[PDB]
Design an enzyme around this catalytic site. Structure first.
Site, PDB file in Angstrom:
ATOM      1  N   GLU A  73      -7.881  -4.949 -11.934  1.00 10.77           N
ATOM      2  CA  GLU A  73      -7.610  -3.771 -12.767  1.00 10.77           C
ATOM      3  C   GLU A  73      -6.169  -3.836 -13.309  1.00 10.77           C
ATOM      4  O   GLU A  73      -5.912  -3.638 -14.513  1.00 10.77           O
ATOM      5  CB  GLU A  73      -7.814  -2.481 -11.967  1.00 10.77           C
ATOM      6  CG  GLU A  73      -7.306  -1.217 -12.694  1.00 10.77           C
ATOM      7  CD  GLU A  73      -7.408   0.069 -11.856  1.00 10.77           C
ATOM      8  OE1 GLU A  73      -6.836   0.130 -10.738  1.00 10.77           O
ATOM      9  OE2 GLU A  73      -8.057   1.025 -12.327  1.00 10.77           O
ATOM     10  N   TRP A 101     -14.143   1.395 -13.095  1.00 11.19           N
ATOM     11  CA  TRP A 101     -14.262   2.191 -14.323  1.00 11.19           C
ATOM     12  C   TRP A 101     -15.659   2.358 -14.905  1.00 11.19           C
ATOM     13  O   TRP A 101     -15.810   2.898 -16.006  1.00 11.19           O
ATOM     14  CB  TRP A 101     -13.367   1.591 -15.415  1.00 11.19           C
ATOM     15  CG  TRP A 101     -11.920   1.835 -15.166  1.00 11.19           C
ATOM     16  CD1 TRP A 101     -11.097   1.121 -14.345  1.00 11.19           C
ATOM     17  CD2 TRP A 101     -11.123   2.876 -15.731  1.00 11.19           C
ATOM     18  NE1 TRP A 101      -9.837   1.652 -14.366  1.00 11.19           N
ATOM     19  CE2 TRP A 101      -9.818   2.730 -15.210  1.00 11.19           C
ATOM     20  CE3 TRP A 101     -11.383   3.917 -16.625  1.00 11.19           C
ATOM     21  CZ2 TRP A 101      -8.765   3.588 -15.557  1.00 11.19           C
ATOM     22  CZ3 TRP A 101     -10.347   4.775 -16.969  1.00 11.19           C
ATOM     23  CH2 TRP A 101      -9.042   4.599 -16.431  1.00 11.19           C
ATOM     24  N   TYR A 139      -4.355   3.630 -19.756  1.00  9.83           N
ATOM     25  CA  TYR A 139      -3.249   2.833 -19.204  1.00  9.83           C
ATOM     26  C   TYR A 139      -2.786   1.612 -19.966  1.00  9.83           C
ATOM     27  O   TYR A 139      -1.685   1.588 -20.508  1.00  9.83           O
ATOM     28  CB  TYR A 139      -3.536   2.391 -17.764  1.00  9.83           C
ATOM     29  CG  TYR A 139      -3.701   3.527 -16.787  1.00  9.83           C
ATOM     30  CD1 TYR A 139      -2.600   4.236 -16.303  1.00  9.83           C
ATOM     31  CD2 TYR A 139      -4.972   3.890 -16.343  1.00  9.83           C
ATOM     32  CE1 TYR A 139      -2.775   5.301 -15.376  1.00  9.83           C
ATOM     33  CE2 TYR A 139      -5.159   4.916 -15.444  1.00  9.83           C
ATOM     34  CZ  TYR A 139      -4.071   5.622 -14.956  1.00  9.83           C
ATOM     35  OH  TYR A 139      -4.319   6.622 -14.048  1.00  9.83           O
ATOM     36  N   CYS A 147      -4.224   9.508 -14.008  1.00 10.27           N
ATOM     37  CA  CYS A 147      -3.826  10.207 -12.783  1.00 10.27           C
ATOM     38  C   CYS A 147      -2.389   9.747 -12.425  1.00 10.27           C
ATOM     39  O   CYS A 147      -1.593  10.525 -11.892  1.00 10.27           O
ATOM     40  CB  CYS A 147      -4.786   9.892 -11.619  1.00 10.27           C
ATOM     41  SG  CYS A 147      -6.347  10.821 -11.712  1.00 10.27           S
ATOM     42  N   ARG A 179      -0.302  12.818 -10.631  1.00 12.09           N
ATOM     43  CA  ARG A 179      -0.618  14.224 -10.843  1.00 12.09           C
ATOM     44  C   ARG A 179      -1.821  14.753 -10.095  1.00 12.09           C
ATOM     45  O   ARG A 179      -1.928  15.962  -9.864  1.00 12.09           O
ATOM     46  CB  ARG A 179      -0.856  14.498 -12.353  1.00 12.09           C
ATOM     47  CG  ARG A 179      -2.217  13.947 -12.862  1.00 12.09           C
ATOM     48  CD  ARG A 179      -2.680  14.514 -14.223  1.00 12.09           C
ATOM     49  NE  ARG A 179      -3.876  13.792 -14.643  1.00 12.09           N
ATOM     50  CZ  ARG A 179      -5.124  14.064 -14.244  1.00 12.09           C
ATOM     51  NH1 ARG A 179      -5.377  15.080 -13.430  1.00 12.09           N
ATOM     52  NH2 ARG A 179      -6.112  13.235 -14.565  1.00 12.09           N
ATOM     53  N   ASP A 214      -6.732  11.980  -4.825  1.00 13.94           N
ATOM     54  CA  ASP A 214      -7.912  12.032  -3.962  1.00 13.94           C
ATOM     55  C   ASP A 214      -7.467  11.310  -2.692  1.00 13.94           C
ATOM     56  O   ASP A 214      -7.528  10.086  -2.616  1.00 13.94           O
ATOM     57  CB  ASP A 214      -9.067  11.292  -4.652  1.00 13.94           C
ATOM     58  CG  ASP A 214     -10.285  11.132  -3.763  1.00 13.94           C
ATOM     59  OD1 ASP A 214     -10.289  11.623  -2.607  1.00 13.94           O
ATOM     60  OD2 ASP A 214     -11.245  10.494  -4.230  1.00 13.94           O
TER      61      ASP A 214
HETATM   62  O1  LIG Z   1      -6.309   6.142  -9.425  1.00 13.99           O
HETATM   63  C1  LIG Z   1      -6.820   7.223  -9.171  1.00 13.99           C
HETATM   64  C2  LIG Z   1      -7.779   7.874 -10.088  1.00 13.99           C
HETATM   65  C3  LIG Z   1      -8.321   9.111  -9.716  1.00 13.99           C
HETATM   66  N1  LIG Z   1      -7.991   9.729  -8.538  1.00 13.99           N
HETATM   67  C4  LIG Z   1      -8.705  11.035  -8.363  1.00 13.99           C
HETATM   68  C5  LIG Z   1      -7.934  12.368  -8.348  1.00 13.99           C
HETATM   69  C6  LIG Z   1      -8.998  13.415  -8.757  1.00 13.99           C
HETATM   70  O2  LIG Z   1      -9.776  13.727  -7.550  1.00 13.99           O
HETATM   71  C7  LIG Z   1      -9.940  12.740  -9.789  1.00 13.99           C
HETATM   72  C8  LIG Z   1      -9.431  12.887 -11.239  1.00 13.99           C
HETATM   73  O3  LIG Z   1      -9.838  14.185 -11.786  1.00 13.99           O
HETATM   74  P1  LIG Z   1      -8.857  15.158 -12.406  1.00 13.99           P
HETATM   75  O4  LIG Z   1      -7.812  15.346 -11.410  1.00 13.99           O
HETATM   76  O5  LIG Z   1      -8.349  14.587 -13.640  1.00 13.99           O
HETATM   77  O6  LIG Z   1      -9.471  16.439 -12.697  1.00 13.99           O
HETATM   78  O7  LIG Z   1      -9.750  11.325  -9.414  1.00 13.99           O
HETATM   79  C9  LIG Z   1      -7.063   9.166  -7.580  1.00 13.99           C
HETATM   80  O8  LIG Z   1      -6.724   9.656  -6.511  1.00 13.99           O
HETATM   81  N2  LIG Z   1      -6.534   7.926  -7.978  1.00 13.99           N
END
Ligand SMILES: O=c1ccn([C@H]2C[C@H](O)[C@@H](COP(=O)(O)O)O2)c(=O)[nH]1
Ligand SMILES: NC(=O)C1=CN([C@@H]2O[C@H](COP(=O)(O)OP(=O)(O)OC[C@H]3O[C@@H](n4cnc5c(N)ncnc54)[C@H](OP(=O)(O)O)[C@@H]3O)[C@@H](O)[C@H]2O)C=CC1
Ligand SMILES: NC(=O)C1=CN([C@@H]2O[C@H](COP(=O)(O)OP(=O)(O)OC[C@H]3O[C@@H](n4cnc5c(N)ncnc54)[C@H](OP(=O)(O)O)[C@@H]3O)[C@@H](O)[C@H]2O)C=CC1
Ligand SMILES: CC1(C)N=C(N)N=C(N)N1OCCCOc1cc(Cl)c(Cl)cc1Cl
Ligand SMILES: CC1(C)N=C(N)N=C(N)N1OCCCOc1cc(Cl)c(Cl)cc1Cl
Ligand SMILES: O=c1ccn([C@H]2C[C@H](O)[C@@H](COP(=O)(O)O)O2)c(=O)[nH]1
Lengths: 223, 327, 328, 226
Positions: free
Chosen positions: B101, B123, B149, B209, B229, B232
């Site tokens: 990636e 993705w 990105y 993110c 921002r 997860d």
């Molecule tokens: O590299 C990544 C990509 C996504 N997420 C997670 C955060 C959120 O749970 C969801 C994205 O949804 P939004 O926050 O945009 O609503 O994916 C991560 O932790 N890391």
């Protein structure tokens, strides 16, 4: 009720273990557990040759003494023996083979009371300021006569093996050397019901390998 | 002896709370092993401690997925890359995909098919006809992720057309610029790589993110801060830490610097409800010493890395944990 | 679970701590006598003071764009509970008319430095001189025409910048308007961010923004804000910065019918200028007073209607002013 | 050596707000520790009341650490040249709260005498006779030290008012001062004394809070060894 030896005399084990070179016929998706770190020595010496950070840690731990805490220990040991009232030092106990694996310039280990277990050699065979004992039972008697802070069992494989079986170890200061090497002797598989990890340190890199330090505590006896 | 202070400490904690406003339904035995440890200094505890903090004090909230989460706002983790490679050990993790990636980002690609052909499905879900349509991207080809990105890193500001266009010299090549600044103006406080292009958010399969990366150089060493921002904790964060730690090593190497700290800043940090039971299990596992990361020392340009130039050594870990929706 | 020597275990885990004498930067043991004499320093202002102390004791010596030299560290976070107090530093005197006017100027989407100059607010004056612009290679920019900075990015991100007098109505992305609507209608959103770092426009700006972005969080009728700052002049800039965004958080909360909670400040390159070291030593040995509180006129319901008289700082108790620009 | 305040662990706990000036200075107002000195008004608190400060007051004056009482009497009795003083005082250790008459009056009947605390009043006019077993009474300052020798208490807290504080300070009987800073202005008639900075020094400051429309914080002054 009455106390067990390991407690009264504050007897601990300190070692360092690497991963073993037994050729897994499947490095791909192998299983890991604490027993993964069990490599103790090879051909009479350390499998990794040398690791300055672990040596520095071993030296720091086996030489550290806290004088203000001794009295409490003096009383405890005296009371246990029905008895009562230089610089304070720790005791290091090792097997004959281990004593011979240490380079001349480090023997006897500094600022520490050296004790060596042996059947084939006697005090006449040593020129050094050290105590020779031919029985584990003799170590306990000696500890009762000495003024020391703590007693560290420092190897080797045969010595670790019997102190654990005789349940004389209160804690195991275990260094996990995260790399593989050829080994011929090992630390005994630790029983999770007898010992439980109570602390894990930061991770470090020294001599081309990462490693950390963990502490096992004798699980309070009733599983 | 100074014991009078001990009583003052108690006084200052007079407004601290009781046991009924801690927040969720946590059972004591849930974390007995975790709570039995006296000293938890292994760096992996920075991640585990955050999980624990969200489970014990998180806020119950619904979210865009409809699954629900426990969340908190504003955390920071620091990993010393000079001492170890922070690949979580309390569960199994593979890095082939996240590395591919990263190489895909560096090439400035936005074509999801490139990853699928290498069997990297990170993705996949974001490039389906259905997903694109829900984002109102009706005129976007399946797997054409838009100006995400890669695109922002090499062509920020350029007009996005389709994933097959030639974007040479269009937009700002941020990546190239930051490498130049690290090499020639190291004390600069403007070495930032930003993916959050406000103007192109809607055209993206989904907004990024990992908002930005800021670099710091001192005494021949490179440190990096990445602001996330949305995080997860159960599934994404473990991989994210690994991604930016590898990127930090890559950037340091092509700039003749040694990697130092990877600093991870978390904005909206959340734990999904369907992940709670698996994380309770993970938190009672004790970490193993971290592994190390080795890069082919011959690669001198950010664009010359290939998947075979990366090696993870001595990875010791607990078994793979499925972070299932059902289980 | 009472154990005595488990204290020794703590000593063991510290076997690898440094023992040198030049703590890096030539600091005397008594420079921080009062600061180090305190046992418990729980006042929120210590988050700022502790960061300064940390940089002074462990900062890295580096040259800078100004050739002034600084001690710098990388990556810190401070959190202020706006529901309990207004974090206006009390270890030195701070004024706020200027920073509030700047905020109102940002909200109107302005890029005209003359507007602030005419109200005797000189925060942006040096960045708008013929010399500063020329040095930025902005030879064709009028004096005080700061370029597509904050205000322009918050209200017209992506619009083509011409000059500070042009009409940008409905051009670009009105981010401010969008985050306010997101906060009102989609509070659990993880996309509530206001970004000023417009990569495409950096070179056209008098100077790249220091305050990169603002992320918002809403829960139980309460609003929290994180502001990421890429460069932080701890001695002069940061005290005002904390104030600006704390006020801004209050403003956004109010117009969205929410209560302010936390203002979280993330610092990237945190530095102390060598010429500020002496003044900060004096400041770190001063003990903070309880913080003041901020009151906003309750009638203002739209982000665009605030005027300078709609703000009031109450019960501000502080130490005497310190002028930081005298080096040594 | 051993000294009274140090032996009997006599501490002072108070709350002081800001005092309004009718004179609007000819310059930007100056601040110092002395800015916080309002203690009372018309026989009551200048601010009516403050739940957080109150909760802090109760918490501090009623807290006791029994595992550390031993060191204290040993310390005390020895000094007293005597050895020790089925119910040694109600079966549970407590602290002593020394207060003045008006102060005693200001406290609501619901809360008089302070729960879990050995109450003690200072009135040259009150007759012990009309007071319970527990609620003691004193003639003068010199008599408190005596009542402390025949008692089993953790620590002794002087809780006001202004006159009481005034003298206990000059009599150098105070070891620490748990000072609450109420950051708002009120009308006052009585005030805490100007703390000699050479005699006392702040060793701890707490977090800042908001209670009953005002912010406040808690600081701790310790007797300097000079
Ligand atoms: O590299 C990544 C990509 C996504 N997420 C997670 C955060 C959120 O749970 C969801 C994205 O949804 P939004 O926050 O945009 O609503 O994916 C991560 O932790 N890391
Ligand atoms: N990884 C680590 O942390 C450590 C590794 N090592 C390594 O281990 C190796 C040594 O291992 P090992 O071969 O087990 O030997 P040891 O060093 O344990 O020595 C055992 C031998 O010492 C004597 N001994 C042991 N127990 C008794 C007893 N109860 N009574 C009398 N004598 C006793 C005997 O000596 P004799 O034959 O005279 O009778 C016996 O043959 C080396 O390779 C060393 O490098 C050593 C310490 C620590
Ligand atoms: N901010 C705070 O923390 C506190 C504020 N207050 C406020 O302060 C006010 C009361 O202040 P103040 O007017 O000073 O009076 P006090 O409340 O301190 O009462 C002192 C009284 O004690 C007695 N007394 C005086 N000198 C001595 C001595 N040398 N030995 C023994 N007893 C003595 C007298 O009793 P008598 O004349 O009978 O002989 C005198 O009238 C109230 O408004 C109250 O609400 C009260 C406590 C705490
Ligand atoms: C493995 C080592 C050190 N580390 C830990 N944690 N635990 C031990 N029990 N250690 O060895 C004690 C016996 C061998 O000691 C030495 C061996 C060598 Cl080769 C040298 Cl140079 C110096 C010394 Cl003191
Ligand atoms: C000011 C207060 C509490 N707080 C601090 N830190 N210090 C004190 N000395 N306090 O008052 C003690 C005398 C008055 O006590 C009360 C007065 C009133 Cl009016 C009520 Cl309702 C209840 C009580 Cl217990
Ligand atoms: O609101 C502000 C504006 C500026 N600065 C400081 C940070 C740097 O010291 C200088 C800008 O320099 P660069 O980092 O852009 O090079 O101004 C602040 O702390 N706060």
């Amino acid at each position: 009720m009455m106390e067990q030896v390991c407690d009264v005399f504050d007897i601990y084990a300190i070692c360092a273990c690497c991963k073993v070179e037994s050729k897994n016929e499947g490095k791909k998706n192998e299983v890991f557990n604490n027993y993964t770190f069990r490599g103790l020595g090879n051909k009479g010496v350390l499998p990794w040759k040398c690791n300055s950070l672990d040596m520095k840690y071993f030296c720091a731990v086996t030489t550290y003494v806290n004088e203000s805490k001794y009295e409490k220990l003096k009383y405890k040991r005296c009371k246990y023996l029905n008895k009562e009232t230089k610089k304070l030092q720790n005791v290091v106990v090792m097997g004959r083979t281990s004593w011979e694996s240490i380079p001349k310039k480090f023997k006897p280990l500094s600022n520490r009371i050296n004790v060596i277990l042996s059947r084939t050699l006697k005090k006449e065979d040593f020129d050094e300021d050290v105590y020779i004992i031919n029985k584990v039972e003799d170590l306990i008697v000696l500890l009762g006569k000495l003024n020391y802070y703590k007693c560290f069992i420092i190897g080797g494989s045969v010595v670790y093996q019997e102190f654990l079986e005789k349940k004389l170890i209160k804690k195991i200061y275990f260094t996990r050397i995260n790399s593989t090497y050829e080994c011929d002797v090992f630390f005994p598989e630790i029983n999770e019901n007898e010992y439980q990890i109570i602390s894990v340190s930061d991770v470090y890199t020294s001599n081309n390998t990462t490693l950390d330090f963990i502490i096992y505590k004798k699980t309070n006896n009733k599983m | 002896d100074d014991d009078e202070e001990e009583d003052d400490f108690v006084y200052f904690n007079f407004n601290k709370e009781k046991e009924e406003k801690n927040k969720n339904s946590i059972h004591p035995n849930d974390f007995q092993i975790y709570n039995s440890l006296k000293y938890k200094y292994h760096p992996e505890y920075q991640y585990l401690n955050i999980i624990y903090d969200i489970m014990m004090n998180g806020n119950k909230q619904s979210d865009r997925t409809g699954v629900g989460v426990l969340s908190k706002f504003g955390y920071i983790m620091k990993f010393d890359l000079s001492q170890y490679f922070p690949l979580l050990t309390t569960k199994k993790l593979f890095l082939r995909g996240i590395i591919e990636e990263l190489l895909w980002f560096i090439r400035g690609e936005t074509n999801g098919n490139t990853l699928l052909n290498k069997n990297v499905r990170i993705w996949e879900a974001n490039g389906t006809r259905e997903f694109l349509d829900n984002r109102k991207l009706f005129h976007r080809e399946v797997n054409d992720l838009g100006p995400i990105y890669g695109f922002q890193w090499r062509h920020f500001g350029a007009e996005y057309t389709n994933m097959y266009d030639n974007y040479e010299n269009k937009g700002v090549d941020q990546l190239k610029n930051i490498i130049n600044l690290i090499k020639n103006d190291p004390t600069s406080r403007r070495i930032l790589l930003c993916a959050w292009n406000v103007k192109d958010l809607d055209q993206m399969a989904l907004p990024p993110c990992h908002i930005l990366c800021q670099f710091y150089v001192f005494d021949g060493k490179l440190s990096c801060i990445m602001y996330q921002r949305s995080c997860d904790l159960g599934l994404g964060v473990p991989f994210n830490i690994a991604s930016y730690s590898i990127f930090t090593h890559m950037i340091a190497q092509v700039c003749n610097l040694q990697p130092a700290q990877f600093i991870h800043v978390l904005g909206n940090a959340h734990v999904y409800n369907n992940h709670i039971d698996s994380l309770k299990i993970q938190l009672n596992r004790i970490p193993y010493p971290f592994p190390t990361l080795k890069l082919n020392p011959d690669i001198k340009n950010i664009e010359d890395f290939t998947i075979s130039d990366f090696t993870i050594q001595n990875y010791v870990h607990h078994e793979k944990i499925s972070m299932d929706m059902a289980a």
